[PDB]
Design a protein around this ligand. Structure first.
Ligand code: 3UW
Ligand code: NI
Length: 393
């Protein structure tokens, strides 16, 4: 899949995007690659942060669905008009599909100044699409309309401008040049988000020793659309305590641990070895097995170049608290080649050929670990009457 290698770009902390075309003749837009959502939505009206947008009137193949869509989320929203048009990925498979497209006509805190993307590609399942699960997501349409295998994989590679990032989205396959060592699979627990189960967490080889349901409260997901590793409150607190203890030779302000303040060292002198590795053990394909993915401080301490002190290497702490479960965001994914094997309801992890490391430690994927009489680490979200009332024909 040589032609699909290196097809992702972006600015650090602002999401990875792929080039796509919409309409006839093709209109090129840069589109955020988001495994944590399920809509294909593109700027389709002027906005201060857009240099360009989808011009429906310029497309001979555009069809209006005569239905609006409204998408609120934590401290943001986008909304607009549903339709269909022809869509391709120039540095993807050699195919063109008719997909649903939400034409974004109004938004708040959605577009990011300087991110260089104009839309979002939700790669998750129909269950979480808006307005409802009857709006077929892009990848479903791609698979149904073409011979493209039902799988994609992601290799995310992490003074006045933010650092440029790159990576690969391989659609329809696995490219062996993008990883080394073994490729380990964890089940997709349920097809909505890419939900997985964490069975154990270690910080510098030390078990956090929590009830494993705490690791997945109220879910754990793999999300390219989240920068940070996000952890449930109780888990976050235990992790921060352990990371603080390991790095105790340095006394950082509270602002740092909250991700609200950078910490710096003289260029090239960053004491990586005082920061511990973090291991997440993921449920294996076999009942009582797990494997671990291990990330370095090179992943969870994000580089931010400072104008005021350009002679220093400065870092943001990129592990943060969640009230909506574990989020394995870019912090996790940057260590690994991640295979979203939809066909076989599983997610694969292998050491990425592009991950940032040093001569002492490396991001790792290791297994199997077998546990006698494995507990169920999955959390069952309480059923609301709202959700229960839904008929599913
Ligand atoms: C959590 N999440 C969002 O809020 C979300 N996608 C995900 N996964 C998202 C992430 C980023 C973003 C910002 C910075 C860095 N990377 C990114 F992808 C920017 C906008 C955005 O829009 C949300 C619309 C509703 C569904 O979720 C979407
Ligand atoms: Ni009914």
């Amino acid at each position: 899949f040589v032609e699909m290698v290196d097809n992702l770009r972006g600015k650090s902390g602002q999401g990875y995007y792929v080039e796509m075309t919409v309409g006839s003749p093709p209109q090129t837009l840069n589109i955020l690659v988001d495994t944590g959502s399920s809509n294909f939505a593109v700027g389709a009206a002027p906005h201060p942060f857009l240099h360009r947008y989808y011009q429906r009137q310029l497309s001979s193949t555009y069809r209006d669905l005569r239905k609006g869509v409204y998408v609120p989320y934590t401290q943001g929203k986008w909304e607009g008009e549903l339709g269909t048009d022809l869509v391709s990925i120039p540095h993807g498979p050699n195919v063109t599909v008719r997909a649903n497209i939400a034409a974004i006509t109004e938004s708040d805190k959605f577009f990011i100044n300087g991110s260089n993307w104009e839309g979002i590609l939700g790669l998750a399942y129909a269950e979480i699409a808006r307005p409802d699960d009857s709006l077929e997501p892009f990848f479903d349409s791609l698979v149904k309309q073409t011979h493209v295998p039902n799988l994609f994989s992601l290799q995310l590679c992490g003074s006045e401008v933010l650092a440029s990032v790159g990576g690969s989205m391989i659609i329809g396959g696995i490219d062996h040049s993008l990883y080394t060592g073994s490729l380990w699979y964890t089940p997709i627990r349920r097809e909505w988000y890419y939900e997985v189960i964490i069975v154990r967490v270690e910080i510098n080889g030390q078990d956090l020793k929590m009830d494993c349901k705490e690791y997945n409260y109220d879910k754990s997901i793999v999300d390219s659309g989240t920068t940070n590793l996000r952890l449930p409150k109780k888990v976050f607190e235990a992790a921060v305590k352990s990371i603080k203890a390991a790095s105790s030779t340095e006394k950082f302000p509270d602002g740092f641990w909250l991700g609200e303040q950078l910490v710096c060292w003289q260029a090239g002198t960053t004491p990586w070895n005082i920061f511990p590795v973090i291991s997440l053990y993921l449920m294996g394909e076999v009942t009582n097995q797990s494997f671990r993915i291990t990330i370095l401080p090179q992943q969870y301490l994000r580089p931010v170049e400072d104008v005021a002190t350009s002679q220093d290497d400065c870092y943001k702490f990129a592990i943060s608290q969640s009230s909506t479960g574990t989020v394995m965001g870019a912090v996790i994914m940057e260590g690994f080649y991640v295979v979203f094997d939809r066909a076989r309801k599983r997610i694969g992890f292998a050491v990425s050929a592009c991950h940032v490391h040093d001569e002492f430690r490396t991001a790792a994927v290791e297994g199997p670990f077998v546990t006698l009489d494995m507990e169920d680490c999955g959390y069952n979200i309480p059923q609301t009457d709202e959700s229960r009332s839904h008929h599913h024909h």
